[PDB]
Specification:
2 copies of one chain form a homodimer.
Chain A: E1 2-3, E2 10-15, E3 18-24, E4 32-33, E5 43-48, E6 53-66, E7 69-77, E8 84-85, H1 87-90, E9 96-98
Parallel strand pairs in A: 3-8, 4-7
Antiparallel strand pairs in A: 2-3, 2-6, 5-6, 6-7
The structure holds ligand 2NC.
Ligand 2NC sits at the interface of chains A and B.
PDB class: hydrolase/hydrolase inhibitor
Keywords: HIV-1 protease, hydrolase-hydrolase inhibitor complex
Assembly: dimeric
């Protein structure tokens, strides 16, 4: 779909079998999801944002549906203000910025 | 134009008489530009995201050109690591997310 930006680009995602709401974020390199239980092994990683750096759990090759679109990639789980779908998965669903 | 997301969606912007590279951020409500001595009346603001918050100066009705596209709106100036074009301006240049 074509999504305008008058409202936050929020969509329903399905991860670990659980439905969640996430923000399609072109300004995010990666996909960061709020702390949750996720099946699989993970490795400690640190990411940055506008206010600084936070520690997250890096889960690789995670199956995730984004607005009805399937993606299999890295999902960082940690204390993010918002669940955000980053470029690693946006590219997987063929998302582009247009104007 | 159409911007793919393999790489950070960075574009040239013009603000306060200066040219800069800015990140088109669909996950940002507002526009945050790197610290610069912009003239005019402003109001203190605190904005956050991953890592926490940063103090910025809110300037209203600031003219900014985004990849050749003119827009006029609120620009927050402060210690941001990257120049961020948020939805307040992305909507003005007619930017959409498509997949
Ligand atoms: C989490 C909050 C929602 C998404 C977030 C994404 N912001 C981009 C801004 C770019 C950095 C300043 C970001 O954090 N991107 C991260 C996302 C995390 C990630 N890992 O992808 C990123 O790409 N980080 C890279 C940093 C690369 C730095 N570049 C470099 N080293 N060369 C990274 N891999 O750690 N939005 C925001 O940060 C904006 N906040 C908001 O829109 C709202 N605030 C809150 C708390 O939700 C609103 C209520 O203010 C800021 C700019 C104020 C308008």
């Amino acid at each position: 779909p074509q999504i305008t930006l008058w409202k936050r680009p929020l969509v329903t995602i399905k991860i670990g079998g659980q439905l969640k709401e996430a923000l399609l974020d072109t300004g995010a390199d990666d996909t960061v999801i709020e702390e949750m239980s996720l099946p699989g092994r993970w490795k400690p990683k640190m990411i940055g944002g506008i206010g600084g750096f936070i520690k997250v759990r890096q889960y690789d090759q995670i199956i995730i549906e984004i607005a009805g679109h399937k993606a299999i990639g890295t999902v960082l789980v940690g204390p993010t203000p918002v669940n955000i779908i980053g470029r690693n998965l946006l590219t997987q669903i063929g998302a582009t910025l247009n104007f």
